[PDB]
Write an enzyme that holds these catalytic residues in place. Sequence first.
Site, PDB file in Angstrom:
ATOM      1  N   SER A 140     -11.118  -1.193  -0.512  1.00  0.00           N
ATOM      2  CA  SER A 140      -9.864  -1.139   0.245  1.00  0.00           C
ATOM      3  C   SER A 140     -10.022  -1.342   1.736  1.00  0.00           C
ATOM      4  O   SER A 140      -9.049  -1.757   2.377  1.00  0.00           O
ATOM      5  CB  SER A 140      -9.184   0.197   0.008  1.00  0.00           C
ATOM      6  OG  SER A 140      -8.718   0.402  -1.265  1.00  0.00           O
ATOM      7  N   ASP A 144       0.822  -1.208   0.000  1.00  0.00           N
ATOM      8  CA  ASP A 144       0.000   0.000   0.000  1.00  0.00           C
ATOM      9  C   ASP A 144       0.855   1.256   0.000  1.00  0.00           C
ATOM     10  O   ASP A 144       1.944   1.232  -0.582  1.00  0.00           O
ATOM     11  CB  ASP A 144      -1.024  -0.075   1.178  1.00  0.00           C
ATOM     12  CG  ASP A 144      -2.297   0.669   0.926  1.00  0.00           C
ATOM     13  OD1 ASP A 144      -2.272   1.917   0.846  1.00  0.00           O
ATOM     14  OD2 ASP A 144      -3.358  -0.008   0.787  1.00  0.00           O
TER      15      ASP A 144
END
Length: 279
Positions: free
Chosen positions: A224, A39
Amino acid sequence: AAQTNAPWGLARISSTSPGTSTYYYDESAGQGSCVYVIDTGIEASHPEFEGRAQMVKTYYYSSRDGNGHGTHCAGTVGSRTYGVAKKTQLFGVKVLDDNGSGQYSTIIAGMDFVASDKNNRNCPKGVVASLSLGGGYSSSVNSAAARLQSSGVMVAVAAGNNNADARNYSPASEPSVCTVGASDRYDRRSSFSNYGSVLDIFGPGTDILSTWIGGSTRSISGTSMATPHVAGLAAYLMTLGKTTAASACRYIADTANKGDLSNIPFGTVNLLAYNNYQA
Ligand SMILES: [Ca+2]
Ligand SMILES: [Cl-]
């Protein structure tokens, strides 16, 4: 164990019904497992991580999460207050820049990195990777995700946020990983969640409170946010010995709350991640 007044999503994954407030979980809490958060990075210094987070790789100038997204997702996996697996080890791999974007070649390289790096970490209950990222279809991205899974890592990926079939998104469309859609606190498919035959599971994704940069917290929404619920659930279940990296997605589908969600298109699973915890 029970966490009172938990974020709704934590309460949801430990209930057969929506609307509860306590997160019930076995106190082993993912101890002995490791989750790689691929990420924007992780603010490891956040008190909520309790020393259990560290950065292990960056593809940018710094390893610092200058965005917040990666810290938020890491917090849903494993922070004290906001995490599913409150005793897991978190490893940050920064493939996304501080605007939350990244090139596919970089995202691929970060997947390959995890497949190798895990061979130098002590993770006796196994390894998970959470990929709250992606764009349009790419066979090369899908192959990288497949490789990471084959290497012995439980890969959880976001379905995407286009209210469209995930078959046209990557790594969402890779069959061999765990593709995660999003739900809301009333058990609706989240308005933005992708769908389709390739989805394996839904997790909470609308209005999810977690950690943020600057030692802060905030609520945001997306597939997400659903993804790290599943990643953390996998870590938890692997620590309990109930499943393995190779089988965890299937196990989570087997044990999920079934047929509780609304606005699920025909042909998409109606499966909501559930820990089946029995005190
Ligand atoms: Ca799959
Ligand atoms: Cl680093």
